[PDB]
Design a protein around this motif. Structure first.
Motif, short mmCIF file in Angstrom:
data_model
loop_
_atom_site.label_atom_id
_atom_site.label_comp_id
_atom_site.label_asym_id
_atom_site.label_seq_id
_atom_site.Cartn_x
_atom_site.Cartn_y
_atom_site.Cartn_z
N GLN A 1 0.81 -1.22 0.00
CA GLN A 1 0.00 0.00 0.00
C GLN A 1 0.85 1.27 0.00
OE1 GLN A 1 -2.50 0.42 3.43
NE2 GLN A 1 -0.84 0.03 4.89
N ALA B 1 1.45 1.76 -3.52
CA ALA B 1 0.16 2.12 -4.08
C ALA B 1 -0.12 3.61 -3.89
CB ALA B 1 -0.95 1.28 -3.45
N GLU B 2 0.22 4.15 -2.72
CA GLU B 2 -0.01 5.57 -2.48
C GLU B 2 0.91 6.42 -3.34
OE1 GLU B 2 1.79 8.16 -1.15
OE2 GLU B 2 0.07 9.54 -1.07
CL LIG Z 1 -2.39 2.96 -0.31
#
Ligand SMILES: [Cl-]
Ligand SMILES: Cc1cc(F)cc(C)c1-c1ccc(C(=O)O)s1
Ligand SMILES: [Cl-]
Ligand SMILES: [Cl-]
Ligand SMILES: [Cl-]
Ligand code: NI
Ligand code: NI
Ligand code: NI
Ligand code: NI
Length: 266
Positions: free
Chosen positions: A102, A105-106
């Protein structure tokens, strides 16, 4: 000095297959390495990439814009923390590999923010998955200026329905090795130089493939070594596939050009 002026995108390095020479490819890889590193963290003469933890987002990515004889252009996004391709833009569309966590992902939400159409593949950009989608191993996919010209076209034509997923995956495998892995390894850069010098297109042999597979383990072995000496050997392969061990950083200094950050410098 009232009004503030901001940069509007990440640094861009350009390469074209149209008129490519050993010199232009060398200059390109040298510029990519220069943008990936600060040059302030060098261990056993090997530059270390920036530490992901605490890295400001405006430092996180660089862009590589590739063009070919048809003046088709695609822009790859490389993560400066590992020199690896996370996605690309062709025209009004951007395509990202499935992020490994994540945090990544960010970070990729900051890429290509002006693009009209954004997509994420359900698959990651690792070789094992790309090979399955391509239906071919790295061992069977030719590299060289010709392959790169074709890969650029395949990436470009994905948006408008031309390119199917197997060919797209094969084209990723070509771009990642000729850009990311060449930036990581003077050895792989030299393999691509030879192909360009002699107008050859050949698949990589086991020495290239094993170096690609071992880059993360080599970065750890070198940074956690005792004065360059590994507590345990790293196994690599020769051109004919026979295995051999490396016990110390010295033999790798002409081989590896960049390392992923593992721990703080001494
Ligand atoms: Cl994320
Ligand atoms: C000497 C060396 C040290 C390393 F740390 C990694 C590799 C791949 C090599 C090789 C260069 C040429 C090889 C061949 O001709 O088989 S093996
Ligand atoms: Cl040293
Ligand atoms: Cl296709
Ligand atoms: Cl430390
Ligand atoms: Ni998911
Ligand atoms: Ni394999
Ligand atoms: Ni350490
Ligand atoms: Ni350390």
């Amino acid at each position: 000095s009232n009004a503030m002026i901001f940069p509007k995108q990440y640094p861009i390095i350009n390469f074209t297959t149209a008129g490519a020479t050993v010199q232009s490819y060398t200059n390109f890889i040298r510029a990519v390495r220069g943008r990936l590193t600060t040059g302030a963290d060098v261990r056993h003469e090997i530059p270390v990439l920036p530490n992901r933890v605490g890295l400001p987002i405006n430092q996180r990515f660089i862009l590589v814009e590739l063009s070919n004889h048809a003046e088709l252009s695609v822009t790859l996004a490389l993560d400066v923390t590992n020199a690896y391709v996370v996605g690309y833009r062709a025209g009004n569309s951007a395509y990202f590999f499935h992020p490994d966590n994540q945090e990544d992902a960010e970070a990729i939400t900051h890429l290509f923010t002006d693009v009209q159409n954004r997509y994420t593949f359900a698959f990651g950009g690792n070789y094992d998955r790309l090979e399955q989608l391509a239906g071919n191993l790295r061992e069977n996919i030719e590299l060289g200026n010709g392959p790169l010209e074709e890969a650029i076209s395949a990436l470009y034509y994905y948006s408008t329905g031309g390119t199917q997923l197997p060919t797209l995956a094969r084209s990723f495998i070509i771009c990642i090795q000729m850009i990311s892995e060449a930036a990581r390894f003077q050895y792989i850069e030299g393999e691509m130089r030879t192909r360009i010098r002699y107008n050859r297109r050949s698949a990589p042999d086991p020495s290239v493939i094993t170096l690609e597979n071992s880059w993360g383990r080599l970065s750890t072995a070198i940074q956690e070594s005792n004065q360059g000496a590994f507590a345990s050997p790293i196994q690599l392969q020769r051109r004919n596939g026979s295995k051999f061990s490396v016990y110390d950083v010295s033999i790798l200094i002409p081989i590896i050009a960049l390392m992923v950050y593992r721990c703080a410098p001494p």
